Design a protein around this ligand. Structure first.
Ligand SMILES: *[C@@H]1O[C@H](CO)[C@@H](O[C@@H]2O[C@H](CO)[C@@H](O)[C@H](O)[C@H]2NC(C)=O)[C@H](O)[C@H]1NC(C)=O
Ligand SMILES: N[C@@H](Cc1c[nH]c2ccccc12)C(=O)O
Ligand SMILES: N[C@@H](Cc1c[nH]c2ccccc12)C(=O)O
Ligand SMILES: *[C@@H]1O[C@H](CO)[C@@H](O)[C@H](O)[C@H]1NC(C)=O
Ligand SMILES: *[C@@H]1O[C@H](CO)[C@@H](O)[C@H](O)[C@H]1NC(C)=O
Ligand SMILES: *[C@@H]1O[C@H](CO)[C@@H](O)[C@H](O)[C@H]1NC(C)=O
Ligand SMILES: *[C@@H]1O[C@H](CO)[C@@H](O)[C@H](O)[C@H]1NC(C)=O
Ligand SMILES: [Ca+2]
Ligand SMILES: [Ca+2]
Ligand SMILES: [Ca+2]
Ligand SMILES: [Ca+2]
Lengths: 523, 142, 49
């Protein structure tokens, strides 16, 4: 089909997949002198390959276990998006070839398998782009990372479900954190895509609700040129606001953090969104003098029992179905498979790449839960007693001719318990509700790398105003310090003094003016 | 946007999802359609512009909704789809240019699919600042 | 311009009325800068604007 590189395996039911194997594509500005050629992906993403392995492991465990889906095999056709909308659209067009050729009837292999369900993309923009085409045929799409609030609009994204909570709770949690540490002068940075803008707007509204003044609001992108990034760094420099709120992903934030480190801008506290609170692209020790002591967010860790061994068992020659294994081997051992020559028997446990050296599984558990949710919808179809099913007159879908819309209908009314004991249900908005873990960016005393240690949680189930819990004794501000940094716009006025309006400046900033002769102010 | 929207239907209770019916009627949309038709016909009539060649057209209705526009765009790029995906009727017309949709979300959705084949899209009504990012909307004009 | 379709005067859409010459702007807790009070100047002080 379109993408020549893929990881596919035949089966009775085919499940699509869209994982970022690369962080982006080559910056090739085509002048269209000749025929345009397919762009190439540049920076390998080991996190994406681990997510792909998570999906493959879940499918293999489904096939092996006879309790869940007996006498039925699950296949997959997993592709690469490279964090790019065009590549994911090509992969999706590969997914919907059968349905679209049926709808259009161009009269031609007549044997292309039909994709029952698709595990959604990572980025919010790419997920929306894929959903706009997948929901056309009502093929369910269970995303694992896409957390945009725009994707809860079931009017537009009919067949979209996700295993990760949206950014409403994340923005509420960041506002709660800001008001918990007694700050009113902050700054906002957002990625110019469908993920950063809605979250930053929600946080701005909530901060204005809580009387928090935002000094600056700037948008960044992975393809930002020198002038725009220089302007952003200048507005960060001129600002007196210490704490800075960032709603961005790793690749979208890398250029800005590189420029900040090059200018050695220090003294800022970064409130990281979950996207880059654990991004190895920014969580590098050479940046710790700038990004140290960054308070971020992380989802609840899952427990996949045999996942570690399956990750360790990847072999370029023993993985016939996985076509991404060769590039993974080449990029993890810096060798060429026919620049040294790969021996074909090296040990993966020797290299330190974000594929096996993980503390917790957060989005890998989301992928596992997505695959299990699709499998459990299929099983619910399998064990549907006639006369009492979700269909008309209590009828049940035929296993030999399951259609995507039936799987989506069963997914809407799904209620199952995962291996951790929690109940997995998708709301009418199609999303899921989960707790948040608040982490801080420290430095390893024995390794020197960035270490994320938990400083508190954010219980979504609690009542408003009591969700946030912070254990400040475990926090090291700016990576090393202990005192809570000062981030008022202006110093507090003491007794006997009155607030003075500063023209053209937000209400969080004022000048202290002493009370007149006949007047007093106690507090 | 000949129609302003579509009817309401959800909760596919064993009902295989069918095409939704557009509800209202926009006479401005039909005007715009006739504007494009008239321009094409006068270009064909004029011998000065494009000698010895006739400009055809193939126009659909978006109903101000993403799904209808996506179906129209899929019908647009079927020939380039066959060329690229290597997936026939052997008579699919070669659409070389698409006059863009009206809505900004509709234009974004159509452009995310047209930019794969680098088909130019000269919209007339979409005016969001998000469509100026040429890193993503490679073949979108305004 | 017919303002509301019938009128001819520019509507007033400020949070608080302009303070007089003898008064000065005073903040209100929880309100933006466009909303203020009209605290009178103390004795010995003046304001012309
Ligand atoms: C930064 O400004 C905030 C106000 O925006 C200060 O928070 C106030 O703290 C006092 C006592 O700690 C409370 O009585 C007030 O109610 C708080 N303000 C609000 C609006 O609730 C905070 O103390 C300031 N930080 C510093 C270091 O001065
Ligand atoms: N736009 C993506 C950002 C992202 C990239 N990698 C991630 C990993 C985990 C969570 C989020 C991300 C999202 O909201 O999901
Ligand atoms: N009703 C508007 C539609 C429109 C104009 N500009 C837009 C920009 C984005 C989306 C829609 C529009 C019109 O007829 O002109
Ligand atoms: C920021 O400060 C620099 C140096 O003082 C100044 O040149 C610039 O105009 C200021 N504002 C912005 C938006 O850069
Ligand atoms: C950056 O600034 C910090 C501030 O203490 C300093 O320790 C460090 O040496 C500086 N590095 C460079 C490269 O200027
Ligand atoms: C899901 O099933 C469990 C099993 O007892 C039940 O307790 C729970 O209420 C169910 N949830 C919904 C939303 O039906
Ligand atoms: C979320 O946090 C609360 C408070 O710590 C806890 O009671 C609850 O069990 C957590 N949620 C899950 C799914 O464990
Ligand atoms: Ca089974
Ligand atoms: Ca100002
Ligand atoms: Ca002519
Ligand atoms: Ca207020």
């Amino acid at each position: 089909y379109g993408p020549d590189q893929r990881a596919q395996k035949k089966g009775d039911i085919i499940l699509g997949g869209l994982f970022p194997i690369h962080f982006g594509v080559a910056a090739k500005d085509q002048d269209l002198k000749s025929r345009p050629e397919s762009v190439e992906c540049i920076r390998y993403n080991f996190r994406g390959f681990r997510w792909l392995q998570a999906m493959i492991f879940a499918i293999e465990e489904i096939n092996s276990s006879p309790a869940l889906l007996p006498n039925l095999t699950l296949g997959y056709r997993i592709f690469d998006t490279c964090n790019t909308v065009s590549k994911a659209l090509e992969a999706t067009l590969s997914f919907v070839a059968q349905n679209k050729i049926d709808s259009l009837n161009l009269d031609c292999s007549e044997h292309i398998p039909s994709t029952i369900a698709v595990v959604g993309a990572t980025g919010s923009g790419v997920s929306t782009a894929v959903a706009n085409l997948l929901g056309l045929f009502y093929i369910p799409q269970v995303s694992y990372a896409s957390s945009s609030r725009l994707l809860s609009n079931k009017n537009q994204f009919k067949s979209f479900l996700r295993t990760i909570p949206n950014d409403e709770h994340q923005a509420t949690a960041m506002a709660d954190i800001i008001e918990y540490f007694r700050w009113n002068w902050v700054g906002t940075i957002a990625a110019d895509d469908d993920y950063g803008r809605p979250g930053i707007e929600k946080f701005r509204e909530e901060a204005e609700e809580r009387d928090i003044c935002i000094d600056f609001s700037e948008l960044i992108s992975q393809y930002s040129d020198e002038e725009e990034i220089q302007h952003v760094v200048e507005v960060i420099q001129n600002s007196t606001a210490k704490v800075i709120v960032v709603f961005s992903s790793g690749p979208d934030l890398e250029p800005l953090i590189k420029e900040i480190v090059r200018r050695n801008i220090t003294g800022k506290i970064w409130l990281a969104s979950e996207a880059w609170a654990s991004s190895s692209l920014i969580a590098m020790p050479q940046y710790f003098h700038v990004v140290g002591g960054t308070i971020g967010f992380a989802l609840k860790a899952g427990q996949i029992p045999g996942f570690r061994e399956f990750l360790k068992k990847v072999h370029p020659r023993k993985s016939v179905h996985n076509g991404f294994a060769k590039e993974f081997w080449e990029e993890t051992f810096n060798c060429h498979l026919q620049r040294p020559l790969c021996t074909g028997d090296e040990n993966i446990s020797s290299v330190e790449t974000p594929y096996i050296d993980y503390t917790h599984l957060r989005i890998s558990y989301n992928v596992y839960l997505a695959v299990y949710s699709i499998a459990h919808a299929l099983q619910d179809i399998y064990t549907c007693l006639p006369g009492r099913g979700l269909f008309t007159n209590g009828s049940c879908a035929d296993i030999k001719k399951v259609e995507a819309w039936q799987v989506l209908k069963h997914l809407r009314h799904l209620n199952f318990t995962n291996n951790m004991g929690e109940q997995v249900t998708f709301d009418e908005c199609g999303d899921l509700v989960g707790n948040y873990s608040i982490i801080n960016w420290h430095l390893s005393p024995e390794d020197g790398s960035i270490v994320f240690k938990e400083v508190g949680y954010y219980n979504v189930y609690a009542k408003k105003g009591e969700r946030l819990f912070i254990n400040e004794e475990k926090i090291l501000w700016s990576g090393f310090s202990r005192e809570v940094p000062f981030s008022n716009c202006s110093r507090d006025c003491l007794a006997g003094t009155r607030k003075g309006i500063i023209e053209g400046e937000p209400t969080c900033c004022f000048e202290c003016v002493e009370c007149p002769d006949g007047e007093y102010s106690d507090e």
